[model samples]
Target: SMEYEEITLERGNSGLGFSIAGGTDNPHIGDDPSIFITKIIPGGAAAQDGRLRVNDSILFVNEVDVREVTHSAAVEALKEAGSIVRLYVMRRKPPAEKVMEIKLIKGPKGLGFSIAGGVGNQHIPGDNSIYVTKIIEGGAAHKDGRLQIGDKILAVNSVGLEDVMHEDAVAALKNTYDVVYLKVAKPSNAETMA
Candidate 1:
């Protein structure tokens, strides 16, 4: 098995975790597949050191080009970092704030959510379709609705959603509060049926 460099650190006092968001127009959008420093654990080594803070984008490590590093690669660097290490970070600013490498400890499970990419066909575009990538087994959806595998999601909140990427579709589903209306299309039925 190929080992990825990234590892899940035990949640530390510093509020930081492995993240895919960094150095893009829509920091929240676009998938980079590269592991970038997303958030710093509050009161952690990075935070207490008064060096690494929240939203500080990482550019490179050990003088190695960060863009070339995969998520696992970044994780490996963090793991190999002995007591102290040097890193290049960019602060969120206009002039492009770049800070020298800073020493920091790693922690576990920061605030994060698993995002899934969506797919659509001719009937569905990048924005209109909805697909369920994951469902917490034995959870609410499983227990109440008894939703099984391979189910197609058609409408959310009673609003028919067109084919779109999984991330965007999931975001739209999460936007609603109280009730979430959903419609699913089955493979068995090719004919239109009410």
Candidate 2:
């Protein structure tokens, strides 16, 4: 649910004890749920604060925005915030840049491989993002070896080069030459975060 995760519990050291049942004024049986972290009191401070859990939902409290606030105004804003609650929550995982699909074939050295970034071509100075570099040995994405050299070309056939500009990703991959359906994105060290 978005890359928002920034916990920092502390109720003196770890004692907000934790508890926040439904929100939107509560009244549910299905669908309509956002504020979570149901219960955790054991060792408190979110059970010795092991990454604040127990359904873990939260949208913010010590920083304000309780999603839409209502479970009694989000437990009275964490019951009158005090020892740096700090949160953003929502952590059940499995989502964050995951794409793969390559199928070259526009041979004769056309769909070879050689691109920099896009959107005015910053080339790569800390990233402008479009990738794949100099992969032209036998051509056609170097014999389709899973086209990888810094990989990161999010789209080409479905048309969407992150923000096309360098000749619009060379006219969206040589203007659809034969078979070029790719969406690669991983290379440059980020293979599902190792």
Provide the clashing-pair count of each candidate structure: 27, 1
Candidate 1 residue-wise lDDT, 60-175, digit = tens: 65556665555566666665655545556654322222222211111232111222335532111112334344555544454454343444555555554554655656666666
RMSD of each predicted structure: 19.1, 13.5
lDDT of 2 by residue, 1-194 (tens): 24467888778544488776777867221345568775778877767767877666788876698876678887788868777778788755422555788887785658878878777664532245688777978777877788878777878888888766778877788788688898887633243654
Error of 2 at 74 (Å): 1.6
Predicted model with the maximum lDDT: 2
Give the distance in Å from residue 164's predicted Cα in candidate 1 to where it truly belongs.
Answer: 22
Please estimate how well model 2 matches the true structure, expressed as its whole-model Cα lDDT.
0.72
Question: How far out, in Å, is residue 17 in model 1?
Answer: 8.2
Task: Give me candidate 1's TM-score against the actual structure.
Answer: 0.34
Best by TM-score: 1
